[PDB]
Amino acid sequence: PLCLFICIILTAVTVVTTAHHTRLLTAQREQLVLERDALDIEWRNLILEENALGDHSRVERIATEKLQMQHVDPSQENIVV
Amino acid sequence: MGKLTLLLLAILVWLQYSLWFGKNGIHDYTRVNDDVAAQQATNAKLKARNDQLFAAIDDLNGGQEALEERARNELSMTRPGETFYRLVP
Amino acid sequence: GTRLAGILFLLTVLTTVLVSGWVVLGWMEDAQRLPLSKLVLTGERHYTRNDDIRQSILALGEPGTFMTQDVNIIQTQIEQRLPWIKQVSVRKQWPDELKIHLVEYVPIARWNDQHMVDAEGNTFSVPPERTSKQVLPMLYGPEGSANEVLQGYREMGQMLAKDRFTLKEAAMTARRSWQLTLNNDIKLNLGRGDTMKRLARFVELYPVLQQQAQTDGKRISYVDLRYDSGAAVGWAPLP
């Protein structure tokens, strides 16, 4: 009958709807790819700044500044499981 | 009927063919949606990994809550007066 | 004859319909233009009162009648007036019928200070007077991590309460460090490392830790636990 003609209107609307959404997801996946790279590069910069700060040569010299004392074996209580 | 309706019929099937197998049809939507779904899930973990480490680094500068953990754990050093215990198997 | 009786019987039944259909119409027409007032608050209400819904619904301005008041605007307004409500369903029925159903959050822990958190991890807020009657743990942590601290608190609490300990406070930092608080102000200072394994150690060390607490008569101030197979215990003078 003429019902098929109306279905073509719906299908074309669905085609334009599906195409518009896929064109937006492609623009977002192309953005998530850039988002990950900036994270890992930021991640690499962080692990380097941690070593520059988590350096025992600089961690211990500030620890003893905060009234800390290296592990002494005499003053060390021991317990067995 | 005849061709007055069949000419308009196969075109709908060609639209049904081009709806699933089109340039941006249903299959490309599902294919890209899964790629976007899995990628943004990873970026959540990567950001959570970086934000935690960024919070750790943000503490060692001008703060002593995290630096004291490094001094206690990795240098085994304690404060004056704290009775240090140790567990042996 | 029969048609005369019939048409008269026809128009007599026709007359009584138009009279009844007009008198009854006057009942429903004059009663469709009145602001519905009464409500029935169905559901399990523990934190909200009856006057809380009445004040929040007339705070929009005009009372509103049937065919003139949007139910979605009411359930919307009620949701922003009461943060402890999960979902509102405002429904009107004929005249003076304000069927407003309510569902509340159930606080199982006090997220930070001003807020609570239910067992499902959702965050909400309750005024202090309506919840100071119940005692529940104090959870702390960076924003958004309300559910993350809950998993830690329960996993740590299940192991801790297994040995008759009471976990009253559980604090987490943005860098994922931890700091627990036990009964009688026993502060536990944990670290970003393996937490469930450090916690399982303090459980085993506690007999000797308390054994030396009254040996010299000193309450356990804190137990700094961020060591490998070690723990530095502080001391406090008991009052």
Numbering used by the authors:
A (entry chain L): 39 to 119
B (entry chain B): 1 to 89
C (entry chain Q): 22 to 260
Lines quoted from the article behind this entry:
The essential membrane protein complex of FtsB, FtsL and FtsQ (FtsBLQ) is at the heart of the divisome assembly cascade in Escherichia coli. This complex regulates the transglycosylation and transpeptidation activities of the FtsW-FtsI complex and PBP1b via coordination with FtsN, the trigger for the onset of constriction. A core complex at the heart of this machinery is composed of three type-II bitopic membrane proteins, the Filamentous temperature-sensitive proteins B, L and Q (FtsB, FtsL, FtsQ). For a long time, the FtsBLQ complex was believed to act as a non-enzymatic scaffold for the assembly of the divisome, but recent studies revealed it to be a positive regulator of the FtsWI complex and a negative regulator of the bi-functional PG synthase PBP1b.
